[PDB]
Structure 1
Amino acid sequence: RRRIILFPVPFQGHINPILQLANVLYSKGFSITIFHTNFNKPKTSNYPHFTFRFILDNDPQDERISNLPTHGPLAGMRIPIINEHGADELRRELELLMLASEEDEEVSCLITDALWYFAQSVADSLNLRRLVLMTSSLFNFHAHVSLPQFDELGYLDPRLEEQASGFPMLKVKDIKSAYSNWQILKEILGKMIKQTKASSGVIWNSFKELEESELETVIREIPAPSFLIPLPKHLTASSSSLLDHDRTVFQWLDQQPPSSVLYVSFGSTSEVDEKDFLEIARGLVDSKQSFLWVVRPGFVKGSTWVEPLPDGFLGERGRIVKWVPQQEVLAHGAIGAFWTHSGWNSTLESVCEGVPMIFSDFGLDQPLNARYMSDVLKVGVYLENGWERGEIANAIRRVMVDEEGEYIRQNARVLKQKADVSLMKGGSSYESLESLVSYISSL
């Protein structure tokens, strides 16, 4: 028997695909151990078939992460901090596990988030193969490796509406938004790319017919074999949710006509002004469409939840909730469209459920996802110029009601079908998974 160790980054958009992958590999006969921080841990009782080992932030907590806040932008500093100081502990934990292994059981490989670049040298030092799971798109990676030219052309220094050079898919504004925090980002992205290239293999949460134009960059830039597997088509991430589900939404969805509901969610970490939260509310009401709006407590700066919102302002058409099983909501027949912040997991879930999108973005890979989905695949409409009630309502009605938006709704249905076909015998994702399992088994 063969065991796989997976090591996720402890945030919702990173824990979800890694535990989806773990379940896919378990279904192929591998045993599974998950290394995880105590911070943002998932419910281990949801995974009785996995062994969990909590590392790196056991108390006594290191002076470096002990004081760090658990929410907000600062919470993510754990990532560079662990990258720079976690190697010795990670090596100890891997050796302990390999020493306690049964005789009929070998550890085939370690799979980490690509952001754990420090894990490559640890795994090398144990003669352990490391595979990398990319939680962002191939298009995003193509932009990463093109950063030399970007800085060179002056894109990275504060021409906004012009097509970027040798990247006609993007506007300069997209690059400026995506790489706005350069000094801090440049080092992380450089190290992540370098150690991804040195890995034994790269698993992408995508499928070939989604990102066909980007396959050549990956083959040329990454010498290790790449595997494209659309995880949401195998299973939802419901079991790895870090917050409790409000499942009362399904009884409400069951009262809505098919394709009549706009689902609205801006992810697991974004936050907005009070000024913008109220403009978003006014756009929603102005569209005259039914909506289900997930608002994380903490989404609005300066309020605990939605205190700025007058009582009854959503009316008959709208409901606001703290958190849902998102892919299961997207699969419900009532859903007509998805207003997303363009996180990659949300984007791919909406594609795999065939739901057209309205795109906003909060930086990082989000503006690139929004531009690729709206202009290359044409499965949504991109609100690329702030929050304005009038523009919001027009975008919503264009995707959900206007005859002019029919091609977008049709494109989303066709793309879902292409994803389903990729999982059949002979399809691209079926063959990638088949190859991934035989590759891991040969290690």
Structure 2
Amino acid sequence: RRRIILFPVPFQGHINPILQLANVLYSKGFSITIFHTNFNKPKTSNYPHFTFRFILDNDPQDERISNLPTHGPLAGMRIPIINEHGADELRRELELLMLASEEDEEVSCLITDALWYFAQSVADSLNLRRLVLMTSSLFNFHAHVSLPQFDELGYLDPDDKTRLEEQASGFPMLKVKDIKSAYSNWQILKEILGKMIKQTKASSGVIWNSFKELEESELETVIREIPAPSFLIPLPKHLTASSSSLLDHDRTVFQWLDQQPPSSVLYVSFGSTSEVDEKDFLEIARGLVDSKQSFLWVVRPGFVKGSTWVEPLPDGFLGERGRIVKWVPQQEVLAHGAIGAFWTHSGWNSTLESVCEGVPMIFSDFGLDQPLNARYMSDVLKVGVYLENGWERGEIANAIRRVMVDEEGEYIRQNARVLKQKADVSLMKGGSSYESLESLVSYISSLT
């Protein structure tokens, strides 16, 4: 028997894809140990077939992580901190487990989130192969490697050059605006994405949460930039991420979806970390009302400054066609026949989820990879509408109706359907994903 150790980034968009991959790999006969912080831990009772081991986080706490907030923006600081100071403890924990390794057993490899760029030399120091799971898109990575051309061109200059600002030089699939919002945090991202790229290239293999027919324009870049083998597996086509939810599913929403006609409900979720002016919040609700479409709206507490929740909503916007909830099994909702469209913040999991369920999109974004994802889906795949100019009453309602009801948007509806079908075909025998997965399984067994 061969064991695989997976090490996720403790946030919802990173734990979902890696526990999905963990399950896929277990279905291939590997045994699974998940290294994880106590912080943001999943429900281990949802994984009786996995062994969990909690690290880096343990209660005699480091000065650098002991007082970090558990939600909002600042919680993400754990990622730079653990990267810069967790090598010693990761090495001990890995080495302890290999030492207790049973007779019949051998650790095939370590698989980490690509942001755990410190794990590469730790693994090397043990003569242990490390593979990388990318949780953002091939296209996004293509932009990271092209940063130096963006910087020297002045695109990553937040204050001024403000100038050309439609269509990027040498990267025509982007506009200048996309680049500016994605890398507006240049100070921190510049350093981190360097190390992430550098250590992903130096790894033993990269697993991408994607599929060849989703991002075919991007395959050449990955082959040329990454010497190790790459494997494209659309994790949502294998199973949803409900078992790794960090929140309680609202569960009442399916009885409500069962009361709606087919393709007639807008699903709306702006991301677990994002934030809006209280004003802009009221503008969003304005567009929904003005769309005349039924909607299911996930709103995370804190989405509105300064309220706990949407207190600033004039009570009774919802009425008949609208509902607001705090958390759902998102992909299961996207699979329900009532859903006709997904207004998303363009998180990569949400985008891939919607693509794998056949649901066309309305895109907003809040930087990082999000504007890139919206640009790509809306302009290249053409499976949604990108509200790329903020939050205006009518533009919002036009996009929703165009996707959901307008004749003019049939091609968007149809494109989503065709792309889902292509995702399904790629899992079958002789499909891109099927072979990517067959190769990954073969490859890992040869490491052992």
TM bucket (normalised to shorter chain) is: over 0.9
Q: CA contact under 8 A between 1:256 and 1:334: conserved in structure 2?
A: yes
Tell me, in whole angstroms, the C-alpha distance in 1 between the residues paired with 2:260 and 2:53.
44
Deviations 1:190-222 (A, max 9, x none): 000000000000000000000000000000000
Deviations 1:216-248 (A, max 9, x none): 000000000000000000000000000000010
TM superposition shift of 1:17: 0.2
Q: What secondary structure is seen at the aligned counterpart in 2 of 1:308?
A: coil
Tell me, in whole angstroms, the C-alpha distance in 1 between the residues paired with 2:166 and 2:392.
23
Tell me, in whole angstroms, the C-alpha distance in 2 between the residues paired with 1:161 and 1:149.
15
TM superposition shift of 1:162: 2.0
Tell me, in whole angstroms, the C-alpha distance in 2 between the residues paired with 1:294 and 1:31.
35
- Structure 1 residue ranges without an equivalent (≥5): none
Distance 1:322 1:346, change over 3 A: same
Tell me, in whole angstroms, the C-alpha distance in 2 between the residues paired with 1:238 and 1:72.
22
Q: Residues 19-38 of structure 1 correspond to what in structure 2 (within 5 A)?
A: 19-38=19-38
1:18 matched to 2:15? The reply is no
Tell me, in whole angstroms, the C-alpha distance in 2 between the residues paired with 1:377 and 1:423.
20
**1:223 is matched with which residue: 205, 222, 227?**
227
Tell me, in whole angstroms, the C-alpha distance in 1 between the residues paired with 2:330 and 2:166.
35
Distance 1:160 1:315, change over 3 A: farther
**1:427 is matched with which residue: 423, 431, 445?**
431
TM superposition shift of 1:124: 0.2
Q: CA contact under 8 A between 1:260 and 1:289: conserved in structure 2?
A: yes
Q: CA contact under 8 A between 1:294 and 1:322: conserved in structure 2?
A: yes
Tell me, in whole angstroms, the C-alpha distance in 2 between the residues paired with 1:73 and 1:304.
16
TM superposition shift of 1:160: 4.6
Tell me, in whole angstroms, the C-alpha distance in 2 between the residues paired with 1:274 and 1:365.
24
Distance 1:303 1:160, change over 3 A: farther
Deviations 1:68-122 (A, max 9, x none): 1111111000000000000000000001111111000000000000000000000
Distance 1:315 1:214, change over 3 A: same
Deviations 1:331-377 (A, max 9, x none): 00000000000000000000000000000000000000000000000
TM superposition shift of 1:312: 1.4
Deviations 1:287-330 (A, max 9, x none): 00000000011111111111111221212110000000000000
Tell me, in whole angstroms, the C-alpha distance in 1 between the residues paired with 2:395 and 2:90.
49
Tell me, in whole angstroms, the C-alpha distance in 2 between the residues paired with 1:386 and 1:212.
29
Deviations 1:394-432 (A, max 9, x none): 100000000000000000000000000001100000000
Q: What secondary structure is seen at the aligned counterpart in 1 of 2:111?
A: strand
TM superposition shift of 1:271: 1.6
Q: CA contact under 8 A between 1:160 and 1:171: conserved in structure 2?
A: no
TM-score normalized by structure 2? 0.98
Instruction: Work out the number of aligned pairs and report it.
Output: 443
- Structure 2 residue ranges without an equivalent (≥5): none
The percentage of aligned residue pairs carrying the same residue is 100
Tell me, in whole angstroms, the C-alpha distance in 1 between the residues paired with 2:33 and 2:315.
48
Deviations 1:174-201 (A, max 9, x none): 0001000111110000000000000000
Tell me, in whole angstroms, the C-alpha distance in 1 between the residues paired with 2:206 and 2:320.
48
Tell me, in whole angstroms, the C-alpha distance in 1 between the residues paired with 2:214 and 2:366.
22
Q: CA contact under 8 A between 1:336 and 1:355: conserved in structure 2?
A: yes
TM superposition shift of 1:389: 1.3
TM superposition shift of 1:127: 0.3
Deviations 1:109-152 (A, max 9, x none): 00000000000000000000000000000000000000010001
Q: What secondary structure is seen at the aligned counterpart in 1 of 2:224?
A: helix
Tell me, in whole angstroms, the C-alpha distance in 2 between the residues paired with 1:424 and 1:57.
41
Q: Identify the range of structure 1 (38-47 vs 303-312) with the bigger mean alpha-carbon deviation.
A: 303-312
Q: Identify the range of structure 1 (155-164 vs 319-328) with the bigger mean alpha-carbon deviation.
A: 155-164
Q: What secondary structure is seen at the aligned counterpart in 2 of 1:270?
A: coil
Q: What secondary structure is seen at the aligned counterpart in 1 of 2:112?
A: strand
Tell me, in whole angstroms, the C-alpha distance in 1 between the residues paired with 2:165 and 2:94.
49
Q: Residues 178-257 of structure 1 correspond to what in structure 2 (within 5 A)?
A: 178-257=182-261
Q: What secondary structure is seen at the aligned counterpart in 1 of 2:231?
A: strand
Tell me, in whole angstroms, the C-alpha distance in 2 between the residues paired with 1:27 and 1:85.
34
Q: CA contact under 8 A between 1:38 and 1:57: conserved in structure 2?
A: yes
TM superposition shift of 1:268: 1.4
Tell me, in whole angstroms, the C-alpha distance in 2 between the residues paired with 1:8 and 1:267.
19
TM-score normalized by structure 1? 0.99
TM superposition shift of 1:161: 3.5
Tell me, in whole angstroms, the C-alpha distance in 2 between the residues paired with 1:84 and 1:160.
38
Tell me, in whole angstroms, the C-alpha distance in 2 between the residues paired with 1:173 and 1:337.
25
